[PDB]
Structure formats: C-alpha cells, structure tokens
Homo-oligomer: A and B are copies of this chain.
Amino acid sequence: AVNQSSSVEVSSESYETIFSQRIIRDLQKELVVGALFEELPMSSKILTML
C-alpha cells in the first residue's frame, strides 16, 4: 500500500510535500451559435413586425 518514503527511517506520515494553488483546464468548446446575429433590443416582452 503506502510506503512513501520508508528510506531508511524518516518516513513521515501525511505526505509532507508541497502543493500548487494553480487551477488549469484543457480545451473548451467552440461557441459558434452565440454570435450569429446582433442582440435586437426590446422594451416589451412581445414585439410585432408587419
């Protein structure tokens, strides 16, 4: 199981090391449909066109 680092005596316990607070992520998807036309402004919750 665990043995890190039993060489030859100072084995420690809870894995005394260091850690990084950097967060990373790979690719994200290509947002092609998010910008296909302008945001047409409406003052009202319905609108009509003749």
Contact = CB atoms under 8 A, between A and B. Distances in A.
Nearest to A19: B15
A39 interface: no
This chain: copies in complex: 4
A10 to B, nearest CB: 10
A9 interface: no
Interface string A1-20: 00000000000001110010
Nearest to A15: B19
Nearest to A21: B16
Contacts of A16: 19
A4 to B, nearest CB: 14
3 contacts: A14-B19, A15-B19, A16-B19
